[PDB]
Amino acid sequence: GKKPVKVKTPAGKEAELVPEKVWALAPKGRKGVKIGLFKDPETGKYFRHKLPDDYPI
Template identity: 55%
Template sequence: MAKCPKCGEEVAKPIKTWVLAPKGRKGVKIGLFQCSNGHYFRAKVE
């Protein structure tokens, strides 16, 4: 679940996810979300 930073709507499922892993650090899973108002945003996925 992620919240759109523009309109505050909550989006349950990301369109896609990937792992962001800086060298020597533990990776963070990032998701690309789209709310029903058409905003795209990235957020950390649990």
């Protein structure tokens, strides 16, 4: 389930974007975080950003 995520673009605007790809980033034995790959919708620049912990992977 790839629902939109409220993120801040590297331009500095709040935007609800569907991530292109999501995965967990976690050392062994750690909870870690969830990461998404996003494309800025007007500049076209790719960037990574943390996702909420409840986001489906």
